[PDB]
């Protein structure tokens with residue numbers, strides 16, 4: 001038991017789901033048809049990978065997941081793609097008309113027509129579970145479905161599953177790949193309405209991933225296909241603790257205990273290393289100390305901010321591959337003296353460490369080099385409020401003139417909702433300011 | 441107390457959600473009602489235009 | 498959201514409609530009978546947006562061809578792709594309108610309107626997921642001007658939650674010297690501000706000025722002007738017709754492009770009438786605008802740019818960043834990231850690389866003020882009103898049409914004068 005149900009909302013959620021599940025399959029030796037030769041217990045089991053996969057009597061290993069989108073085209077490519085045999089048709093849910101980059105259509109208008117079906121389908125997966133841990137929600141901030149329908153879903157999941165945990169993987173928007181002028185509105189709206197109903201949310205800044213693909217992988221103009229493969233590696237490092245057995249393995253819930261000091265302060269900064277091309281990785285073995293040091297270089301972060309001009313409330317290092325505690329400890333000591341790691345006075349400064357022995361895997365015909373060892377740092381830094389600030393400024397510029405507000409009001413929303421949402425973010429920015437102030 | 445607060449949160453989430461979804465349906469319908477009423481006002485105007493051609497001959 | 502329902506009303510509307518269907522049929526690999534003869538799968542992937550699939554793998558346009566004047570029925574049926582249209586979708590009247598808006602809107606066109614509404618309802622009922630409607634018309638005529646605007650108001654009643662797109666052709670004394678065209682345009686504008694979600698201003702003055710000064714033709718026919726319009730109409734529907742992320746349907750475009758409900762009048766553009774930086778400078782230049790307005794006399798609320806052809810996307814990104822930096826004052830600071838850019842692999846017939854420009858500029862007031870000046874020159878001495886007051890209208894309605902287009906200009910000016918701080 002300790003099952004985990006992944007819910008993928010909207011295009012960005014769905015396509016990140018494709019990347020993640022394709023990657024999980026290669027990690028566990030699961031075939032596209034669903035078969036897993038190394039799994040001897042047919043029809044079921046209590047193994048670590050069974051937190052993400054149920055088993056049919058025919059030996060098929062089936063992702064504990066639901067794909068939702070308010071239009072058919074993106075989910076159709078999962079239904080007809082390489083992994084079509086992996087999912088039951090009822091796990092893949094589509095409507096006909098999308099939310100048109102409008103939170104209102106996603107949360108209210110189009111969304112209400114499909115919400116009961118979605119919850120019903122999540123319940124079929126939940127009743128398959130002997131000890132459900134919680135949900136992992138994959139969505140964009142910027143899309144109408146990713147913002148509006150996600151929020152709606154999270155509200156309903158709190159009703160139907162109480163305080164059962166709900167983690168987010170939220171795609172924060174960026175002008176290089178963004179498709180809509182109103183993403184700030186959608187982002188602030190969903191962030192506000194989701195905030196009470198999420199326990200932990202890993203933000204991924206598309207610009208941060210875009211720059212990494214440009215700088216580290218030498219991709220001239222990164223596509224979603226390029227970005228999603230990188231995201232799935234970070235997602236895999238975070239969920240590897242759940243999916244794998246291990247002596248020195250630390251559960252994700254144990255990291256959460258340290259990462260969330262107050263309920264609203266639940267946004268850890270993700271930083272990953274090494275991201276390196278096959279050409280550069282050849283005759284270039286990166287040691288524990290090198291990849292650990294790369295975690296404190298802000299160019300490797302999943303979100304654009306500067307931790308060095310903020311304060312730390314928690315630092316966690318999730319290692320996978322050829323790593324032993326001795327090396328990690330040596331590396332941390334070196335960093336402590338040489339880098340800008342200032343903690344708040346009310347936290348303890350010790351880094352928390354987990355190691356999974358299964359080394360990292362690469363999707364065939366990819367951009368990333370296959371490396372012997374890798375690390376994901378999850379830190380709780382006040383610097384991540386910078387991401388809120390940038391986004392909140394874009395909101396204010398438009399909302400001051402009520403630009404585009406009529407599209408939301410036409411679908412039933414009030415101006416009250418916009419300002420209520422903005423004041424919650426103002427408070428959230430004030431909260432990250434407050435935690436960094438010293439005690440008295 | 442743990443049960444009381446866990447139930448309170450479920451209760452108030454359910455009531456907060458139902459209030460918003462009903463308030464939204466009121467607002468959307470009223471927005472569409474005003475749009476059609478303005479369009480039906482054009483039919484009443486176009487009927488007076490067609491009457492003022494025949495009542496001027 | 499896939500199926501769009503095309504409507505073409507009047508002489509202008511039907512002839513630009515005809516050219517539209519000729520170009521996109523060629524791009525999608527459809528011949529005059531309606532068979533598929535191409536090669537790429539991308540031609541068929543979103544074919545259903547504009548074409549119905551009949552028996553024997555026939556692809557039939559979802560077009561409704563409308564006019565009070567017969568004879569225009571012959572020209573469309575005798576034209577290069579006349580056979581491909583659905584014969585029942587022709588809905589043609591008797592005595593015409595003769596450049597009279599009140600005939601198109603209130604009386605003679607009002608009698609033909611229900612027989613057109615039948616064809617729309619029949620086409621709309623069969624749509625798996627109807628997204629909306631695109632009209633093609635002039636605003637200087639009688640039928641397309643008046644009946645086309647009645648059709649807009651009527652289709653809105655039965656489909657208030659679908660998108661109403663228009664390709665409204667603005668009249669110019671340089672192309673047509675009919676004296677009452679400023680009356681017709683202003684009356685149509687009064688309807689378009691209230692009842693459409695997005696109107697492309699295809700201006701005959703700009704089309705004349707381009708044909709003369711750029712294309713080198715000493716006096717241009719209606720065929721020369723349409724070569725530009727068909728290239729423009731093909732460009733702005735490339736996001737709707739091929740696979741892509743940006744502005745892929747009529748509501749997503751509308752949501753990105755229209756920041757205020759009344760301010761939905763776009764300045765189209767096309768290039769060339771070549772390298773990526775040259776394209777990018779040409780499309781933002783006033784000489785390539787299909788509306789006769791200078792962008793440097795106002796600011797862009799929003800812009801959509803569509804590049805077509807095999808080209809480096811890195812170069813496109815750098816170039817679109819280049820012009821935003823260099824022309825920063827001509828984009829409102831209070832809407833961030835308001836210029837969006839798509840790139841389609843398939844270039845149009847003839848050209849290897851093209852670029853299409855949709856901009857919602859406050860400088861569009863220059864087009865409305867020009868019509869407003871030609872309007873008030875006639876109205877203040879009560880000239881030619883017997884054509885309209887005879888058919889049943891009042892002076893009050895003429896005054897409201899002037900006041901609404903003056904308000905529209907005042908609002909474009911307000912947001913042009915707006916600042917962040």
Ligand SMILES: Nc1nc2c(ncn2[C@@H]2O[C@H](COP(=O)(O)OP(=O)(O)OP(=O)(O)O)[C@@H](O)[C@H]2O)c(=O)[nH]1
Nearest residue numbers: 010011012098099100101140142143144145146224
């Ligand atoms: N990283 C990443 N971002 C994506 C992907 N697809 C879309 N996005 C981003 O997601 C945002 C747009 O929202 P989408 O998820 O595409 O839209 P949606 O949730 O399907 O909502 P509607 O389409 O409006 O119903 C923009 O910020 C895009 O850059 C993807 O595959 N990967």
Ligand SMILES: Nc1nc2c(ncn2[C@@H]2O[C@H](COP(=O)(O)OP(=O)(O)OP(=O)(O)O)[C@@H](O)[C@H]2O)c(=O)[nH]1
Nearest residue numbers: 507508509594595596635637638639640641668673
């Ligand atoms: N760009 C372009 N403009 C045209 C074309 N045909 C007509 N026009 C313009 O349309 C305006 C007159 O409207 P028409 O379309 O002829 O009139 P109508 O809508 O058919 O109405 P009636 O003639 O009253 O039946 C003039 O300003 C012309 O310059 C064309 O093929 N291309």
Ligand SMILES: [Ca+2]
Nearest residue numbers: 039041044045
């Ligand atoms: Ca087993």
Ligand SMILES: [Mg+2]
Nearest residue numbers: 010011098143
């Ligand atoms: Mg979508």
Ligand SMILES: [Mg+2]
Nearest residue numbers: 507508566593
């Ligand atoms: Mg005519």
